[PDB]
Enzyme design. Sequence first.
Site, PDB file in Angstrom:
ATOM      1  N   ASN B  10       0.830  -1.171   0.000  1.00 46.87           N
ATOM      2  CA  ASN B  10       0.000   0.000   0.000  1.00 46.87           C
ATOM      3  C   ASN B  10       0.883   1.246   0.000  1.00 46.87           C
ATOM      4  O   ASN B  10       1.247   1.752   1.031  1.00 46.87           O
ATOM      5  CB  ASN B  10      -1.001  -0.038   1.176  1.00 46.87           C
ATOM      6  CG  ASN B  10      -2.177   0.909   1.005  1.00 46.87           C
ATOM      7  OD1 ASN B  10      -2.526   1.280  -0.043  1.00 46.87           O
ATOM      8  ND2 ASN B  10      -2.790   1.262   2.099  1.00 46.87           N
ATOM      9  N   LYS B  12       1.183   4.498   0.044  1.00 46.22           N
ATOM     10  CA  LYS B  12       0.581   5.754   0.341  1.00 46.22           C
ATOM     11  C   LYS B  12       1.734   6.691   0.560  1.00 46.22           C
ATOM     12  O   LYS B  12       2.476   6.550   1.487  1.00 46.22           O
ATOM     13  CB  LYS B  12      -0.291   5.660   1.595  1.00 46.22           C
ATOM     14  CG  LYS B  12      -1.490   4.745   1.512  1.00 46.22           C
ATOM     15  CD  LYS B  12      -2.475   5.027   2.617  1.00 46.22           C
ATOM     16  CE  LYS B  12      -2.097   4.377   3.932  1.00 46.22           C
ATOM     17  NZ  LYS B  12      -3.034   4.711   5.012  1.00 46.22           N
ATOM     18  N   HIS B  94     -10.252   0.528   2.885  1.00 47.52           N
ATOM     19  CA  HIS B  94      -9.053   0.741   3.666  1.00 47.52           C
ATOM     20  C   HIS B  94      -9.380   1.683   4.856  1.00 47.52           C
ATOM     21  O   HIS B  94     -10.114   2.589   4.699  1.00 47.52           O
ATOM     22  CB  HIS B  94      -7.932   1.342   2.800  1.00 47.52           C
ATOM     23  CG  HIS B  94      -6.681   1.681   3.551  1.00 47.52           C
ATOM     24  ND1 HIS B  94      -5.923   0.750   4.207  1.00 47.52           N
ATOM     25  CD2 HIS B  94      -6.027   2.848   3.693  1.00 47.52           C
ATOM     26  CE1 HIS B  94      -4.883   1.332   4.757  1.00 47.52           C
ATOM     27  NE2 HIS B  94      -4.919   2.605   4.453  1.00 47.52           N
ATOM     28  N   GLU B  96      -8.213   4.093   6.315  1.00 49.99           N
ATOM     29  CA  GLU B  96      -8.093   5.503   6.056  1.00 49.99           C
ATOM     30  C   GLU B  96      -9.302   6.021   5.340  1.00 49.99           C
ATOM     31  O   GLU B  96      -9.791   7.040   5.704  1.00 49.99           O
ATOM     32  CB  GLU B  96      -6.818   5.840   5.288  1.00 49.99           C
ATOM     33  CG  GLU B  96      -6.481   7.312   5.262  1.00 49.99           C
ATOM     34  CD  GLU B  96      -5.202   7.612   4.503  1.00 49.99           C
ATOM     35  OE1 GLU B  96      -4.146   7.191   4.946  1.00 49.99           O
ATOM     36  OE2 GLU B  96      -5.291   8.250   3.465  1.00 49.99           O
ATOM     37  N   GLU B 164      -7.397  -5.345   8.967  1.00 48.35           N
ATOM     38  CA  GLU B 164      -6.664  -4.243   9.524  1.00 48.35           C
ATOM     39  C   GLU B 164      -7.059  -4.017  10.991  1.00 48.35           C
ATOM     40  O   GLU B 164      -8.117  -3.577  11.259  1.00 48.35           O
ATOM     41  CB  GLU B 164      -6.939  -2.983   8.738  1.00 48.35           C
ATOM     42  CG  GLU B 164      -6.592  -3.077   7.294  1.00 48.35           C
ATOM     43  CD  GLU B 164      -6.798  -1.829   6.515  1.00 48.35           C
ATOM     44  OE1 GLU B 164      -7.825  -1.193   6.576  1.00 48.35           O
ATOM     45  OE2 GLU B 164      -5.878  -1.576   5.753  1.00 48.35           O
ATOM     46  N   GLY B 170      -1.471   3.186  15.360  1.00 52.26           N
ATOM     47  CA  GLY B 170      -1.387   4.562  15.814  1.00 52.26           C
ATOM     48  C   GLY B 170      -1.984   4.858  17.177  1.00 52.26           C
ATOM     49  O   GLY B 170      -2.111   5.989  17.568  1.00 52.26           O
ATOM     50  N   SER B 210       0.712  -3.901  11.550  1.00 54.02           N
ATOM     51  CA  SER B 210       2.084  -3.589  11.368  1.00 54.02           C
ATOM     52  C   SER B 210       2.900  -4.850  11.083  1.00 54.02           C
ATOM     53  O   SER B 210       2.928  -5.776  11.821  1.00 54.02           O
ATOM     54  CB  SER B 210       2.620  -2.853  12.595  1.00 54.02           C
ATOM     55  OG  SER B 210       4.005  -2.942  12.677  1.00 54.02           O
TER      56      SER B 210
END
Lengths: 242, 245
Positions: B10, B12, B94, B96, B164, B170, B210
């Site tokens: 991915n 990004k 996703h 995000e 995910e 985070g 991760s």
Amino acid sequence: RKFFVGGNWKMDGRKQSLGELIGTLNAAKVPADTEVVCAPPTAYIDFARQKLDPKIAVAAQNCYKVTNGAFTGEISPGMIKDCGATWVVLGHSERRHVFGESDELIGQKVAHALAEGLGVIACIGEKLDEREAGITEKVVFEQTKVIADNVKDWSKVVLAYEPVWAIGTGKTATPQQAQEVHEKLRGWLKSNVSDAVAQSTRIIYGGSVTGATCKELASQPDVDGFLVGGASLKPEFVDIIN
Amino acid sequence: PSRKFFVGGNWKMDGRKQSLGELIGTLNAAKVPADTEVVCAPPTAYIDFARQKLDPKIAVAAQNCYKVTNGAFTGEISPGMIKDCGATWVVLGHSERRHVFGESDELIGQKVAHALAEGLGVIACIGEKLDEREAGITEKVVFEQTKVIADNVKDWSKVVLAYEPVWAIGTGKTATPQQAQEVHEKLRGWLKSNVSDAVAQSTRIIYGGSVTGATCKELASQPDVDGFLVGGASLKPEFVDIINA
């Protein structure tokens, strides 16, 4: 002022259809007093720049402001530049009125794009109800002011007046109307910024322009070109250029 | 048969030809094993460039797309455009998109259906946020997200699911390989219960948490982990190590 024609290639893009257009443009005459800019869909900026004759510039349809994580979001000015585009279109009617981009966001985008070294085609326009309601001047002026607040050098800026009622509603513009609204824009620039700026700044028209209606509009003393919508995708785009 | 190990990157980034080209160059030069299905998802602006440098073996994905369109072409890239540019996959749902740009479950379902209709493969992302996990609703959240995707899938041949753990991205929470396996096992079970045994056994479920060069092999060893959706590490040399996990 150099005559300015932009092509807003809003489409479900393909290499074949875009390629044809480009071939047509590449074989076309660009008059010497004319600057031409084409804005493909984002996926095709690179392809377009690669195929297009260098006589013609490439613009992005949009960009984001200072990035804040969130990379899936809009193309950055850095990317736009990287792909070889030298312009961006900002505050276009569709972004303002379908996707709800705020006056403040647009001003932020203009500032960012300019800082990153792109040219800007900055778009303003009144809606119909606004037109009828006698708040056209107030509306365009406020829109312009926010753009103006974010411009240090106007050399790389072009203003595009897009009267929205000239997309998606049942009404038409004339060389007269275009001049009126256009003439007022220059006056705002002259008082608000400078006479020198007001003289040198191209103000192009973005209402629905066709090969039929282009020449009269061009003849006006304060119309310096066009931001073309659907016609940009047609052979008549060449007529518009000329 | 065994599920083919799948690795998606991915990408990004604020993209550049130079940085992207270099990364592609590294991939091209690497010995990507025949036994790994590799997919790279660059920024839109770079949906035709990568496919022009990357190895044919490697497959390109769009980071997003739109569902049926109407006017408003300045909006998200279409599946037709993605295909036209030579991408054969799209990443949908996703975190995000869901959790920062506010894409609904309903919208993601429409996107899945449209993408498949147009002949693209789909990497469909699901996962629970930290509040959801703390409240004990991990299974409920991911099952519902999966149901929406499922309702818009007819042929699973061209679908891969990516879990995910948004809760561990985070936030300061760390997902253990054991934890990842638990979620993956449950998801497969949902597939078994709600679609078919064959679909459950054959569908790749990839890990979007991760993953690094140091951690990939242990994760890859988990029975229900079919590969990775690699975030930040995908922009790094260890992406090759991950491929080879």
